[PDB]
Amino acid sequence: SDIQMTQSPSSLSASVGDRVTITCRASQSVSSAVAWYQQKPGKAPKLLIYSASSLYSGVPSRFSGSRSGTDFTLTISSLQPEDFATYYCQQYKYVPVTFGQGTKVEIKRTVAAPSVFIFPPSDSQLKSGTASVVCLLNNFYPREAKVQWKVDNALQSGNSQESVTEQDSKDSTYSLSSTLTLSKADYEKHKVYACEVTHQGLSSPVTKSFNR
Amino acid sequence: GTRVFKKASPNGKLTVYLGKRDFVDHIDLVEPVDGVVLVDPEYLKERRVYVTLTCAFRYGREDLDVLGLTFRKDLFVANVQSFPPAPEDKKPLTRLQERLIKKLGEHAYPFTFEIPPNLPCSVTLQPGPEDTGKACGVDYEVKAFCAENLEEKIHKRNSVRLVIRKVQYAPERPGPQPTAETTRQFLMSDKPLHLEASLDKEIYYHGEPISVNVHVTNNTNKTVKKIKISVRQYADICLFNTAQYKCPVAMEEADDTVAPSSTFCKVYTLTPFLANNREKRGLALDGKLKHEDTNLASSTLLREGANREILGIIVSYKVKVKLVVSRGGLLGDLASSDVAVELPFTLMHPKPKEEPPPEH
Amino acid sequence: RTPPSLGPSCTTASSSLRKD
Amino acid sequence: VQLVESGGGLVQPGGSLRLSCAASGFNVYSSSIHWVRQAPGKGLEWVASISSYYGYTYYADSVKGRFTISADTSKNTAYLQMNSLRAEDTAVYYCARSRQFWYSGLDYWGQGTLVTVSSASTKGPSVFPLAPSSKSTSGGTAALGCLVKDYFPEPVTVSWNSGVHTFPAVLQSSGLYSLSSVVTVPSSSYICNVNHKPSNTKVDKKVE
């Protein structure tokens, strides 16, 4: 059966400067012959470490990994900006070469407040015949949050649809959105429409709204 | 670099651990072969355990109708009398040899093998799909025996033998650029035919384009019909009596015509590789370990002395530029008018950064 | 005129060693 | 010093796409050439491996009978023939260098190419604003924006002609790419254009 190359941390935040550690374990004994790659999204991987000890030529010397036996670690000592990317654990001793789940790193900022607003569905949408009503959390930290939707004090049934940006470049702050797609047939069979946010920065949930 | 190699005998009495499998041979010193053997004297049935590195020629007979019946003729073999310490042979272990006892205790005994310089490098001769057993040529083996005296037999499970390579890599300093030229004069005139040949560099790595710059200055009343161009592996094998072959591995018989009293410059590029030369049974591949796919055997690097009629398989390479000169006139087709120049280069692997050699 | 060979005989392995 | 991928696009779930990876700057006999089907965040998955110097091809099992890897080494390029393409193979396919001697992890990847396979033709988006109010202005700053909804191919380049957070798209109930995009300007005072490449339409709406 194929090998799996599962990394111990799935994602993680931590502090610009400190030491980061990704364990990766293979479903069997791939002696050595593990490889690591970073990928800022929108580009394609640079290569980081071959054979599990040797680091690639052209790489930050703050990199290297190792093997505890079947367990394969990757570690960075004093990171920097533009290292805010996902890290990929690869085994290449057998065919097929296996890859890693992924491991997302984010610059860890202090909890910014998610600046929540709301927007009625545009005029031209209502001429179409369906409504996309856009919520916009903006410029915050950390990733996790929850936007609960309502049509007259009853929650959504999956018509809502989330979509986030990554770590902002020079900000290390996120941004979220959630389109509630609902038929104009049903846009107007109600009055109340609510975007229920719950964040670290927002202990008691703030809920904005609109009736147009 | 924190790992070691280990394979033990069938019955697990005799375990062998080795640093590397590739022991590289700069022309002067061959990296010693250092390792340890562990004994489990719960099963120390016998009363002596030796060790031997062997250099041997592995050949299947022309007439041998047996699939895989290969024999080995011994070129160099030595012994370290290691289990247990024989009188007087007291030696200092290596950086490697140390960390292995520290790991395993004195349950394990050392050996060191200072390979000599005038030896073949591990080279293996390409098989045909006919042949089936262990690949033929020069292979090496550390074997781990148990037998009361040296003049005692070895039981087929009371033993382990590992295969090492002694290999070479490309030298750092690029040789001077290869140019040879020649000039033929025929009966019919004194105006000559001239052929100059130049490679772009003297060292090439496996899979790299070799670029041959030609310059035919024809002052004859003969025509150059075509221009064969070829990369040829010279082999110099020495088992019982010296053999030799020069089989071609890369070729391009482009049909360029140099008509009489014409110049010509063309730069034909050309790449060796083992995809198209698999039919050529007996061609030398580099050193095979069990049965993997090797490369076109790298150039063998002899000493500046060029000591002896050396054993094993001395490979070299040489680009050939033959001009195919139209015959006819006074002697007709009777006398051959072709003109060729041979250029020798070096084809090996570069020095690995640190890391030595399915989906590789 | 010398010992022959009828094998392909085991799977070779690698253990771990003391970092130094 | 280079590597590309030309080709790749929208194809029915029964037919064929084939991809041309027109490499440059090195020898096709010292490298091994691979194809990686990461796709859109599902993970990283290998497709193909040709070793020209030896002439061998290795295939990830899910693309055996309907994926072909070739290479015409004169042009230094390499090929992926994709017959019987399903909707799972929908991906961003990737070309990847190697050292033949010896394999020590994937040297150089390429710009990539969006393959796309679902049972629905190209469409252009319709562009409708997100026009601010008292409900989209906070502490001087207000939020203008532009939903972009219901278009099929690989996504678009917004053209407002900082604070311009643009979202990776979502696949709706119909499988048409929809994505939102805002700005934060000051509450005094701006128009948005979206330029779908596979649509030959460049809708420039204005946020009021």
Numbering used by the authors:
A (entry chain L): 13 to 224
B (entry chain A): 5 to 361, 366 to 368
C (entry chain V): 346 to 353, 357 to 368
D (entry chain H): 17 to 177, 183 to 210, 216 to 234
According to the publication:
Arrestins recognize different receptor phosphorylation patterns and convert this information to selective arrestin functions to expand the functional diversity of the G protein-coupled receptor (GPCR) superfamilies. The recruitment of arrestin by GPCRs is normally preceded by the phosphorylation of GPCRs by a group of GPCR kinases (GRKs), which generates diverse phosphorylation patterns that determine distinct arrestin functions. In this study, we determined four crystal structures of arrestin-2 in complex with different phosphopeptides derived from the V2 receptor phospho-C-tail, that differ from the fully phosphorylated V2-receptor C-terminal phosphopeptide (V2Rpp-FP) by only one or two phosphates at resolutions ranging from 2.5 to 3.3 Å. Arrestin activation is characterized by interdomain twisting, repositioning of the three loops (finger loop, middle loop, and lariat loop), and breaking of the polar core. Compared with inactive arrestin, all of our solved arrestin structures bound to the V2R phosphopeptides exhibited substantial structural rearrangements at the three loops, and this effect was accompanied by a 16° to 21.6° rotation of the C-lobe relative to the N-lobe.
The binding of either V2Rpp-FP in the previously solved arrestin2-V2Rpp-FP complex structure or V2Rpp-1 in our solved arrestin2-V2Rpp-1 structure disrupted the ionic locks, that formed between R62-E66 and D69-R76 in the inactive arrestin2 structure, which caused a nearly 90° twisting of the finger loop. Compared with the V2Rpp-FP structure, the absence of the phospho-interaction at the V1 site in the arrestin2-V2Rpp-1 complex structure resulted a lack of interactions between the peptide and Y63, R65, and F75. The movement of K77 away from T347 in the arrestin2-V2Rpp-1 complex structure resulted in loss of the H-bond that formed between K77 and pT347 in the arrestin2-V2Rpp-FP complex structure. Loosing these interactions caused approximately 10° tilting of the phenyl ring of Y63 and repositioning of the side chain of R65 and therefore potentially promoted structural rearrangement of the packing between L243 and F61, which might establish a path for the propagation of conformational changes toward remote functionally relevant sites. Importantly, RMSD profiling between the complex structures of arrestin2-V2Rpp-1 and arrestin2-V2Rpp-FP revealed that eight residues exhibit changes in the main chain Cα coordinates between 1.5 and 4 Å, and these are concentrated at the β4–β5 and β5–β6 turns and three functional sites, including the nuclear localization sequence (NLS) and the c-Raf-1-binding and clathrin-binding sites.
